[PDB]
Amino acid sequence: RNLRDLLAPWVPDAPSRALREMTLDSRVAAAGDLFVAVVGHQADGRRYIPQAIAQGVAAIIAEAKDEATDGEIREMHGVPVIYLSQLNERLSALAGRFYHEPSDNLRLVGVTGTNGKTTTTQLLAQWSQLLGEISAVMGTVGNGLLGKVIPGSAVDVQHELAGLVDQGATFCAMEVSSHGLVQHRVAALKFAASVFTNLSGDMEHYEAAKWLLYSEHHCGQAIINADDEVGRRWLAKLPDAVAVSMEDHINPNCHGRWLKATEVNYHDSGATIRFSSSWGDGEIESHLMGAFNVSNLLLALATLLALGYPLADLLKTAARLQPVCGRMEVFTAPGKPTVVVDYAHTPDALEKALQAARLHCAGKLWCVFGCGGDRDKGKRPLMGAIAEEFADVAVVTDDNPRTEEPRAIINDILAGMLDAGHAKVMEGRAEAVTCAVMQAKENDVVLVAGKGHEDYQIVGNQRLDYSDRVTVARLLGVIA
Numbered sequence: 001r002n003l004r005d006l007l008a009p010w011v012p013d014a015p016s017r018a019l020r021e022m023t024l025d026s027r028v029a030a031a032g033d034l035f036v037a038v039v040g041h042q043a044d045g046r047r048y049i050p051q052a053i054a055q056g057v058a059a060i061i062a063e064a065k066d067e068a069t070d071g072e073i074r075e076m077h078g079v080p081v082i083y084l085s086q087l088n089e090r091l092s093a094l095a096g097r098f099y100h101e102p103s104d105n106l107r108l109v110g111v112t113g114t115n116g117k118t119t120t121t122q123l124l125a126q127w128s129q130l131l132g133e134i135s136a137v138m139g140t141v142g143n144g145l146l147g148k149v150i151p152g153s154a155v156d157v158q159h160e161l162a163g164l165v166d167q168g169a170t171f172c173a174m175e176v177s178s179h180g181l182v183q184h185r186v187a188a189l190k191f192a193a194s195v196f197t198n199l200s201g202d203m204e205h206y207e208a209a210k211w212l213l214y215s216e217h218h219c220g221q222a223i224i225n226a227d228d229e230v231g232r233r234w235l236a237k238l239p240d241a242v243a244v245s246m247e248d249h250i251n252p253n254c255h256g257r258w259l260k261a262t263e264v265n266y267h268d269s270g271a272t273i274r275f276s277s278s279w280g281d282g283e284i285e286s287h288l289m290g291a292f293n294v295s296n297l298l299l300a301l302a303t304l305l306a307l308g309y310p311l312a313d314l315l316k317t318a319a320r321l322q323p324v325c326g327r328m329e330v331f332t333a334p335g336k337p338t339v340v341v342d343y344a345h346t347p348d349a350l351e352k353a354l355q356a357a358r359l360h361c362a363g364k365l366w367c368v369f370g371c372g373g374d375r376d377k378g379k380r381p382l383m384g385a386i387a388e389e390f391a392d393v394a395v396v397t398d399d400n401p402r403t404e405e406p407r408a409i410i411n412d413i414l415a416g417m418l419d420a421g422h423a424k425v426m427e428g429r430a431e432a433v434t435c436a437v438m439q440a441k442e443n444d445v446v447l448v449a450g451k452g453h454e455d456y457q458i459v460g461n462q463r464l465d466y467s468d469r470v471t472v473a474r475l476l477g478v479i480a
């Protein structure tokens with residue numbers, strides 16, 4: 001790592017200087033480091049150049065705006081200070097070159113959209129690893145090789161992807177936030193593929209701004225959900241993009257690449273997905289629950305087919321795809337009710353989780369849930385009303401009551417129902433889960449909402465050992 005080589009594409013006469021790490025933060029800038037002095041909202045890092053220098057950085061690259069000409073080389077206290085115009089726009093490319101272009105040294109798939117990025121990225125990482133990749137994720141749950149995810153600037157993005165390349169990753173599925181894209185945080189990444197899940201003359205400006213942004217990126221293969229109105233508008237303008245549909249939105253007149261679910265059977269342990277595609281037809285046994293997870297899986301499949309992974313190998317490994325832990329996570333047992341563990345802890349998330357569960361439910365849908373104590377009370381009646389409408393049996397119990405009188409929380413929930421008398425109340429969460437699971441019929445579905453992956457019940461100040469997954473697994477005669 002050398003200032004001269006680093007800047008060779010832009011500043012021909014930059015001085016030779018060994019460089020350790022690249023940092024935007026003058027406070028951690030250490031001996032031998034490259035300090036990058038950027039102007040943001042309020043903040044001007046050029047202010048902290050003297051401090052960086054005094055802490056012994058080998059060199060500084062700085063915003064040229066109002067101070068200098070693009071590629072102007074100064075020298076302060078023996079330290080080279082090189083000025084660049086539009087540093088925020090160019091920071092991805094600078095960090096890419098610094099970290100040896102990590103997106104050129106693995107297959108990077110970007111996933112964008114309002115919902116399904118976490119699931120779609122986890123399915124991409126899992127499926128590619130089943131076919132022999134060493135796969136990683138970068139996103140909301142964190143960064144890391146599959147199974148070792150550790151819970152943000154253009155520099156941090158390149159540095160983290162370099163770290164994954166260093167650990168042997170050959171494939172990375174990356175959640176791309178709308179805000180990340182607009183702030184040029186992935187501006188110089190070589191995406192092998194770009195996946196659109198869904199969105200939500202204003203619409204004219206919004207679209208113009210996004211089209212310009214994406215015209216500037218290396219998107220690779222575009223994989224677009226054609227069931228989304230905005231998805232279709234972009235497929236209209238991208239003849240090489242892959243159309244993915246589970247609601248009959250493939251227009252065969254276009255002769256583009258396509259993949260569509262022809263029929264879906266939502267059953268007690270998953271979904272049987274029959275599909276047709278320009279690669280061939282097939283049937284997948286998904287162990288994931290709900291319509292949105294069919295969409296997410298079909299997007300992962302279309303992407304991997306577009307990248308050249310053979311259909312027969314993808315079909316052969318589909319049954320090993322797993323849910324995101326505690327996200328619509330199914331537990332089934334010989335002649336026991338189907339039980340789904342989901343983290344849903346808001347009115348909207350509860351409604352979606354119940355609507356998803358219902359598709360798989362031939363009998364009665366049960367909803368076991370509560371609301372957190374010493375937190376906003378507003379959601380309590382709203383989650384009551386949702387459980388009453390979208391389930392057949394509401395079991396209201398405790399969920400981290402903390403210092404709040406547990407029954408007061410249950411009262412607030414019941415107050416949102418038309419017929420509170422129809423709700424089952426049971427305190428002890430473990431007892432309420434047992435009550436549902438032991439009373440439910442064989443073709444009933446019990447949704448245990450609010451905790452998902454969390455392994456604790458906060459009663460008072462005590463963080464007690466408790467897992468919904470473990471309680472459910474133990475009651476069904478299976479292993480969490």
Ligand SMILES: c1cc(-c2noc(C3CCCCC3)n2)ccn1
Nearest residue numbers: 112194195196211214215219222
């Ligand atoms: C050339 C290419 C592009 C482009 N390619 O794909 C995308 C998006 C599609 C949805 C998935 C996210 C990327 N935009 C835009 C303008 N000019």
